[PDB]
């Protein structure tokens, strides 16, 4: 039977930046003036510092910036936004590791204690940097006796609900990927708290044979037409990866299935053999339907 024609194509491009300390600055990244552009500062983490060889440990939701704050400061956020009225800057929470040391687990002491610490500390980072929202990117779960799915759903849902109360215009997102545990944690969060989660930054970087079939699996896992496509730069596999992402994004857009697109990461692109070419190509697609 005919499938309903999708009507979701949008004008959003997002760029993760700051995790890899390659000297990248907002001003290095080409910004297409004909779309909505977001940077995502990578990452604030509720772990202690690894500086000088210390072992990071969970802080129960007391987040600190661990991106390259020297090159991506509050003044730098203000400057890129003054030069580019289409730019917003968000803070990412979590990520894989604490500056390439300990893996970042979702490890609350309790819902209420973690939420209280997370609201205060993340609101503090949003205030200090003048930010426009928050991306939730927990990727490691203690799924065999540690903090379970309902604890995660309540922690993130209540954090985003209170931030939407305190910063009513902010943009929230979640960043799941295709891992059975990760999907079990994020799918019920979207079901129970979609009202306070604006975007799904699904990481597409399976035996599913095509990019669009893989995307449609996630559109069905996270209903509402707000799943962004994505790809990664600076890959061991080379330009094969990003070229498949570009082709996938073009095919999604042909089908009305491309609300937006994001790249991991500015830092990787900067030191790649292709510079920011994929940011330019991705933004050309998003700006010119």
UniProtKB/TrEMBL annotation:
<comment type="similarity">
    <text>Belongs to the glycosyl hydrolase 18 family.</text>
</comment>
<dbReference type="InterPro" id="IPR001223">
    <property type="entry name" value="Glyco_hydro18_cat"/>
</dbReference>
<dbReference type="GO" id="GO:0005975">
    <property type="term" value="P:carbohydrate metabolic process"/>
</dbReference>
<protein>
    <submittedName>
        <fullName>Putative class III chitinase</fullName>
    </submittedName>
</protein>
<dbReference type="InterPro" id="IPR001579">
    <property type="entry name" value="Glyco_hydro_18_chit_AS"/>
</dbReference>
<keyword id="KW-0326">Glycosidase</keyword>
<dbReference type="Pfam" id="PF00704">
    <property type="entry name" value="Glyco_hydro_18"/>
</dbReference>
<dbReference type="InterPro" id="IPR017853">
    <property type="entry name" value="GH"/>
</dbReference>
<dbReference type="GO" id="GO:0004553">
    <property type="term" value="F:hydrolase activity, hydrolyzing O-glycosyl compounds"/>
</dbReference>
<keyword id="KW-0378">Hydrolase</keyword>
<feature type="domain" description="GH18">
    <location>
        <begin position="11"/>
        <end position="289"/>
    </location>
</feature>
<dbReference type="InterPro" id="IPR000677">
    <property type="entry name" value="Chitinase-like"/>
</dbReference>
């Amino acid at each position: 039977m005919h499938h309903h024609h999708h009507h979701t194509n949008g004008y959003l491009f997002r760029e993760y930046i700051g995790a890899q300390f390659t000297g990248v600055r907002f001003s290095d990244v080409p910004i297409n003036p004909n779309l909505s552009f977001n940077f995502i500062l990578s990452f604030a983490i509720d772990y202690t510092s690894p500086a000088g060889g210390a072992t990071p440990a969970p802080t129960n939701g007391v987040f600190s910036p661990y991106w390259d704050t020297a090159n991506l400061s509050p003044a730098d956020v203000a400057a890129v936004k003054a030069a580019h009225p289409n730019v917003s800057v968000m803070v990412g929470l979590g990520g894989d590791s604490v500056q390439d040391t300990a893996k970042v687990f979702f490890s609350p002491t309790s819902v209420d204690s973690w939420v209280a610490n997370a609201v205060a500390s993340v609101s503090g980072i949003i205030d200090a940097y003048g930010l426009d929202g928050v991306d939730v990117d927990y990727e490691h779960f203690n799924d065999d006796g540690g903090a379970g799915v309902d604890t995660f759903v309540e922690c993130i849902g209540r954090l985003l609900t209170e931030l939407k109360a305190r910063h009513p215009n902010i943009t929230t997102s979640i960043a799941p990927f295709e891992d059975a545990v990760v999907q079990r944690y994020y799918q019920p969060l979207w079901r129970r708290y979609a009202g306070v989660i604006d975007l799904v930054n699904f990481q597409f970087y399976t035996d599913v044979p095509t990019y669009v079939m893989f995307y449609d699996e996630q559109a069905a896992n996270y209903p509402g037409g707000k799943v962004l496509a994505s790809f990664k730069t600076g890959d061991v596999a080379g330009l094969l990866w990003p070229e498949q992402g570009i082709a996938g994004a073009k095919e999604l857009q042909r089908q009305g299935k491309l609300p937006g697109l994001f790249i991991w990461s500015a830092d990787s692109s900067k030191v790649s053999s292709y510079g920011f070419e994929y940011e330019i190509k991705a933004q050309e697609i998003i700006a010119n339907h």
